[PDB]
């Protein structure tokens, strides 16, 4: 299983990835990933239980969520893997990512509606069902609510942080995890969600297929951090209320721990790390 930079996919691989995503949507499976994510967004809080977000388990949680989604894609087409979007490099609305043969482009200015690509509402193939904003069409406003995607220099400063995470293990923390997540500092992962806009800026952000490519690159950055800091590892390592410690299991699966997810190579490799 090799996760490739989206920019490098062949036309055949783009076609097959799109078709596999649209089949998970058609069969009803896709929308339950949107629902799960929103349930965790809404329940993960800085002063109580927190598992998928604003906590050390942000990274292994999204790694296991993306694996569940990749395995569902592979149950439709075994050749498909999740690509990643290096937003530090492919940073404009002209990136091939946003072309009509892949994810389609930005939304029109009146109502944010995406008008091209396979996920445009007009195709009839991408109803937005799990939602808060009552509109049922995919929306985006690339670069509308924040002017720029992170740069490579910004990513490198976060990558340079040696501690995985620090007490109080939440959105106030210093350390790598919270700087990558983006609640402190120059802001990597949260800013990308804000930059895409539309559903990607909300708790039902997996409604946009770019969600997966965004988190696959966040996931790659955790792998690169590990290569940079082989002396550093997941914390906390035991007895922390409300936070998933290294060897504690994670909801919703209950059968996997951060410890089981630290090494991505047990599940996939990258085109280049």
């Amino acid at each position: 299983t090799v996760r490739k930079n989206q920019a490098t996919l062949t036309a055949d691989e783009k076609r097959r990835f799109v078709a596999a995503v649209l089949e998970l949507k058609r069969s009803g499976r896709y929308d339950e990933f949107v629902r799960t994510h929103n349930e965790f967004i809404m329940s993960d809080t800085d002063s109580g239980e927190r598992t998928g977000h604003r906590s050390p388990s942000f990274l292994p949680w999204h790694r296991r969520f993306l694996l569940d989604f990749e395995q569902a894609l592979q149950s439709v087409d075994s050749s498909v893997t999740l690509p990643y979007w290096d937003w530090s490099a492919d940073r404009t609305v002209r990136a091939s990512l946003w072309a009509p043969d892949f994810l389609g482009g930005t939304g029109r200015s009146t109502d944010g509606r995406v008008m091209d690509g396979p996920f445009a509402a007009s195709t009839g193939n991408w109803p937005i069902n799990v939602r808060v904003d009552s509109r049922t069409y995919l929306r985006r406003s690339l670069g509308g609510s924040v002017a720029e995607l992170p740069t490579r220099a910004e990513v490198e400063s976060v990558l340079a942080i040696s501690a995985y995470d620090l007490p109080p293990y939440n959105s106030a923390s210093e350390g790598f995890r919270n700087h990558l997540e983006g609640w402190r500092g120059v802001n990597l992962h949260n800013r990308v969600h804000v930059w895409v806009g539309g559903q990607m800026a909300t708790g039902v952000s997996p409604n946009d297929p770019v969600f997966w490519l965004h988190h696959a690159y966040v996931d790659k950055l955790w792998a690169e951090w590990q290569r940079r800091h082989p002396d550093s590892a997941y914390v906390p390592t035991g007895g922390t209320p409300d936070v998933v410690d290294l060897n504690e299991t994670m909801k919703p699966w209950n059968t996997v721990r951060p410890a089981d997810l630290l090494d991505h190579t047990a599940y996939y490799t990258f085109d280049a790390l």
Partner: protein, 74 residues
């Protein structure tokens, strides 16, 4: 200590906030999930990656996001 309540018409929509977790926001009578961050900033489920300083700011961000659309309850 929770923020004060508020009630105004913003962009033609009624937004209300009140202490109650901890604090409730409504847009035209429909409750909007909002959350407070450790540093005191707020977000809503329709701007959940974008901290703003107050619950009124989160309610206004939600009205901006919705572009007139009814909110669905959570």
């Amino acid at each position: 200590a929770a923020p004060e309540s508020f009630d105004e018409v913003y962009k033609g929509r009624r937004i209300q906030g009140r202490p109650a977790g901890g604090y409730e926001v409504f847009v035209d009578g429909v409750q909007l999930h909002v959350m407070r961050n450790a540093d005191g900033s707020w977000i809503s489920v329709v701007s959940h990656y974008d901290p703003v300083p107050t619950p009124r700011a989160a309610a206004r961000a939600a009205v901006d996001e919705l572009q007139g659309a009814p909110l669905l309850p959570f």
